[PDB]
Amino acid sequence: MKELIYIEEPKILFAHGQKCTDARDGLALFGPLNNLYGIKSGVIGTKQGLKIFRDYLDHIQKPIYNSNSITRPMFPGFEAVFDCKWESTGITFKEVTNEDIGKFLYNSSTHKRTYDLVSLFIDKIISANKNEDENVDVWFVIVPDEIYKYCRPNSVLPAETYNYDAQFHDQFKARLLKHTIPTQIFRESTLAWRDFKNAFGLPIRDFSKIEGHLAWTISTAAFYKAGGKPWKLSDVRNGVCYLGLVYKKVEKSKNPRNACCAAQMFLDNGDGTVFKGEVGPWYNPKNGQYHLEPKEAKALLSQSLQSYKEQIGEYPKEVFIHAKTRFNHQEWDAFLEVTPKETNLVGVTISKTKPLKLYKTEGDYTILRGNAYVVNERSAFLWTVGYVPKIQTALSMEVPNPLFIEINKGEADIKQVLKDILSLTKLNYNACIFADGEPVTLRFADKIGEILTASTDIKTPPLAFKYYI
């Protein structure tokens, strides 16, 4: 038993120097910060893919209706919001012969067919980019649904190139990092789902009242990948640099080799936000140890601090190294070795697998979003999914799980640290949602890690987020 508290809602700075809380309303009211003049696209896939992509592009011309405006806001049109053009006339087509796809389903090995299909697509993409005089921005892929149907690992019949994953999407994105060509992979079922039904008279996937949110998500992603900045934070102070470390298991080698991939964010002195990945994979041959060796710790911290100095000029006064795990004395001392004097070093640990669900005594609706339970000077509980008065709906259908935020090494106030976490959940550019369940400094690090682990032939990988999401 202890009293709760409230941690408000963040503000995000749209065009004209205006403010709001929901990205949808702000974008549909004031407009984006960047003026992209147009978008050029190229579709790879059988003629069915070209037809479906063209129909979807022409579909946004017709009005899109959502069931409820307050619960799920509608889509007021591409050009009416984003101040650009994305039409079905700049489409550049590279047909994939169905015979090539069919003839490749004979090796009966998932790795070989996955590699062969990834090659069959990326070869055409690379050759089109290299040997064609048209200028493109985003490349779209429309995979046949039977390919994904036959890629299930649990399927039975009724070493130079062996270090590759068994997934189409991860490997496909992996082998285009040395060409810097932004790509969006589409499953043919998602675009054309009405024609996909089951033995019940109804579509397999229902988007009837949630077509508007799908249009929002796809439009926002395709705008971000082409060099746009739809919204930006405004309550960020100076001197603060955030890092999020996420550990993985590369496997596909002599040792488990738990790699580490990070992200970085701070202020750029031009009233802008620098949300970029920080990934040169650091590897630990030890199994199960989720702590970095002192050399790796110094390398990671020094690279991040050098990037901060190059962007601004002087080192930060406060760095928050977020992680999903705890830390040990040797790693923190290794951080302290390279860290300057007037540079406070604070460690934060965030967890969700803590059984504590609050049931409302009076009503049946869920708990308020921004509530908190301050356990102690060095720990507190933050709710990020639930009921928001602006949308008048519940983020999670059931009783949501809170977040167990604790500070491990260093000293920092336990409400400012919790307010920054809630303030960092408004910059998820992959999806158009009011809020997420994790700070993005620990969310996009996972995607960065999972992309550049399928292949290990990459030196100095890109840092922009348009080649990863």
């Binding site: 409230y6 007021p76 009416a80 049946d364 008048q392």
Partner: protein, 419 residues
């Protein structure tokens, strides 16, 4: 006179009208609309007519399927025609065609040859055309500033959406452990104890340590399973109390405080398992933790104060289940969770993980916060013995009282919950 009136189909076309009005205001143009204000009951058409006739420079009407053949639209068109006749102004009414399917065979007779602004291609093009037409008509304006639009958004959109201080009361699943024994005991049995007896099967909880036995129980107890206990001296037991080793006031080279706390946790968990075995309740084997559920018909009509614990779904049965844990952070708690399981007829399980998972997924859709809370509390009160508590035997005569009321939390900020 520095004003524009928009007539629409309330509430069918609120979104488009609101977006257009906010866009026009953002550039510094005054826009007057019916949905902007909420003054009802007082003379409303008279004020509307006076504003239209006196200080209205431009009038626009939007047309939709709903707005077609409507009394309000016809009356507004008549008023606009009267105003135009009085002012002898040709350009005073401009339709805003937004219905693509509204064919010219069924459009209003009052608007059949009027120049209608096209919004079918792109709404931004229509907005630009509106701005160009207003500039051509010399609509009065001030310096470009969205301050008026920002003020309107602050004072209208978020009027009843500010911070409201209201006390709230919360339930949870932390059940605080109340009663604690006097001391902890290691019963030294140097080459005098069974080695592979599986000491986790006795009638009293036990956690081993080297060749000792760490439990709150007395040496004379559980002698049934250990015949060679009587020939033993009481001076060979390291008694350690409980309150200080909970508070961390124990620093001895014999056992580390963390290890003793771990043994405490294990004793509490084993006592819970044994006692729930004593209740004669069924057991489910999940991946790591074991849940608890009743048979069909254990209680009267499968109810406990109007709370259902065993039911039937389509041609299948379901039993509510819970799980517990004994953690000591931040304060001694017995955290409780919730799960659901399924039985084909009412007494036998289905040996299929996929079927159980899908069945749980289907059922939990219709259960809300109140449902889970009621079921959890009611199943907990099934345990509580006499008036407010329940015991976990951890010795010869030592009972550990676990409460039956969830830990409460207090909050100071809430919402008005407008249905």
């Amino acid at each position: 006179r520095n004003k524009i009136f928009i007539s629409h189909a309330t509430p069918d076309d609120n979104d488009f009208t609101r977006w257009l009005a906010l866009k026009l205001i953002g550039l510094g143009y005054e826009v007057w609309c019916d949905i902007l204000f909420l003054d009802k009951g007082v003379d409303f058409w008279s004020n509307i007519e006076k504003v239209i006739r006196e200080d209205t420079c431009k009038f626009l009407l939007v047309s939709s399927s709903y707005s077609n053949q409507r009394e309000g639209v016809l009356k507004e068109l008549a008023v606009a025609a009267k105003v135009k006749k009085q002012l002898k102004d040709d350009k005073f009414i401009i339709p805003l065609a937004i219905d693509e399917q509204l064919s010219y065979d069924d459009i209003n007779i009052d608007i059949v040859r009027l120049n209608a602004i096209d919004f079918k291609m792109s709404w931004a093009r229509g907005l630009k055309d509106i701005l160009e037409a207003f500039e051509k008509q010399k609509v009065p304006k001030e310096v470009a500033d969205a301050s008026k639009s920002n003020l309107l958004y602050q004072q209208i959109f978020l009027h009843d959406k500010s911070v409201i201080e209201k006390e709230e009361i919360y339930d949870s699943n932390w059940l605080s452990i109340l009663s604690f024994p006097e001391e902890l005991r290691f019963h030294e049995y140097n080459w005098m104890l069974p080695k592979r007896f599986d000491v986790r099967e006795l009638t009293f909880p036990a956690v081993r340590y080297k060749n000792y036995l760490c439990t709150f129980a007395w040496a004379y107890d559980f002698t049934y399973h250990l015949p060679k206990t009587e020939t033993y001296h009481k001076s060979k037991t390291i008694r350690i109390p409980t309150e200080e080793i909970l508070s961390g006031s124990y620093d001895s080279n014999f056992i580390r405080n963390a290890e003793c706390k771990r043994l405490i946790v294990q004793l509490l968990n084993k006592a819970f398992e044994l006692r729930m075995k004593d209740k004669e309740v069924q057991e489910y084997e999940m991946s790591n933790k074991t849940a608890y559920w009743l048979e069909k018909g254990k209680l009267e009509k499968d109810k406990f104060e109007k709370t259902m614990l065993v039911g039937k779904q389509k041609d299948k049965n379901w039993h509510f289940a819970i799980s517990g844990a004994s953690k000591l952070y931040p304060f001694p708690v017995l955290m409780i969770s919730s799960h659901i399981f399924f039985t084909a007829d009412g007494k036998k399980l289905i040996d299929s993980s996929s079927v159980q998972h899908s069945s749980r997924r289907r059922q939990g859709k219709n259960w809300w916060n109140n449902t889970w809370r009621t079921k959890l509390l009611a199943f907990i009160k099934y345990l509580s013995d006499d008036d407010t508590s329940f015991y976990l035997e951890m010795g010869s005569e030592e009972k550990v009282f676990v409460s039956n009321e969830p830990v409460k939390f207090k909050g100071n900020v809430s919402y008005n919950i407008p249905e």
